[PDB]
Design a protein around this ligand. Structure first.
Ligand SMILES: Cc1nn2c(nc(O)c3cccnc32)c1C#N
Ligand SMILES: [Fe+3]
Length: 330
């Protein structure tokens, strides 16, 4: 068995290896990358996403979200308060203001300590799930707007055409912007490219140990747990590395910098935070190995979880039993 300790693997493909996305995902899995729940991919020195980021200031963040926390420093939930629209240029200026800017720090470990010590006492603002792409349409390799779709994969594996599309999303973050513990919709893969700016620190639980995190969350958020039987689907809960360690939860951490890809694997729980102003692009994707995970994915019927219409067909085909109740919760 490859990678039995479930370490996060880092890959440095050559330009030749970078020419077939599916093939390289499969290669990474042959080396056991998926066991960690997350892998980093450093693109060939020859590669670029686009020529320059000098012309991105006029993108609109229609609904910036302020992330307001409740609880304790290492165990907290966050809710999203809507703010007035701003452009990326205005958002960048806000992120670099005295109120929101990254504080002085010695290194990534120092900033991480500051994050978990003080996150709950500030309410950073970000732009999330903005449909669009910053890849140059002429970038031919690992262009997140030119991947094959999950709908075509499901048709290819299962024989059935379904409605739906699958397009990338942009994220604009600042210091302390927080990604709560979650897996992807339908326990899909995700690929995330950090286009520009300051780093992101990621935490991940190996997929074989996802249920341990779920059990701890039920203990730490007891009211939420009584509310939805899959409340981590709400994407509001945070648990620090110290608390994970105290509770024997296996996990790993890694910092992603501008110019690097991260892939999250089916049922790999992950959470993280931004170090300062940045822009990332992400999209979900599927391989044949995903199908069995999609069949088994937990669903929220709280009503609280966000659902795009594209997910309807995946539940409909892969989880016909659960479809009725999940539909109602939508
Ligand atoms: C832990 C983590 N997950 N995650 C992150 N950042 C994104 O931009 C993102 C986009 C889609 C889905 N998950 C995302 C982080 C960080 N840091
Ligand atoms: Fe994610």
């Amino acid at each position: 068995a490859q990678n039995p300790n479930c370490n996060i693997m880092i890959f440095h493909p050559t330009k030749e290896e970078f020419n077939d996305f599916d093939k390289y995902i499969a290669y990474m899995e042959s080396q056991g990358a998926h066991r960690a729940g997350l892998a980093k991919i450093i693109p060939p020195k020859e590669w670029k996403a686009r020529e320059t980021y000098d012309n991105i200031s006029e993108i609109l963040i229609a609904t910036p979200l302020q992330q307001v926390a409740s609880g304790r420093a290492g165990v907290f939930t966050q809710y999203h308060k809507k703010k007035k629209a701003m452009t990326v240029g205005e958002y960048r200026h806000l992120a670099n203001s005295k109120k929101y800017q990254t504080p002085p720090h010695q290194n990534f470990e120092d900033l991480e300590r500051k994050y978990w010590k003080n996150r709950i006492y500030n309410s950073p603002i970000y732009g999330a799930d903005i449909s669009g792409s910053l890849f140059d349409e002429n970038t031919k390799q690992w262009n997140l707007g030119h991947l094959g779709t999950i709908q075509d994969l499901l048709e290819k594996e299962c024989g059935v055409v379904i409605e739906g599309v699958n397009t990338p999303y942009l994220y604009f973050g600042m210091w302390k912007t927080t990604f709560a513990w979650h897996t992807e919709d339908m326990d899909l893969y995700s690929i995330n490219y950090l286009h520009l700016g300051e780093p992101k620190t990621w935490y991940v639980v190996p997929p074989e140990h996802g249920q341990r995190l779920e059990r701890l969350a039920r203990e730490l958020f007891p009211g939420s747990s009584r509310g939805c039987g899959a409340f981590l689907r709400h994407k509001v809960a945070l648990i620090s590395p110290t608390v994970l360690k105290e509770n024997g939860i296996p996990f790993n951490r890694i910092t992603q910098e501008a110019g690097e890809f991260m892939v999250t694997f089916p049922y790999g729980y992950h959470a993280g935070f931004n170090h300062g102003f940045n822009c990332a692009e992400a999209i979900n994707f599927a391989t044949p190995r995903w199908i069995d995970y999609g069949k088994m994915a937990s669903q929220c019927s709280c009503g609280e979880a966000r659902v795009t219409f594209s997910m309807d067909a995946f539940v409909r085909i892969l989880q016909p039993e659960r479809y009725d109740l999940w539909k109602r919760g939508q």
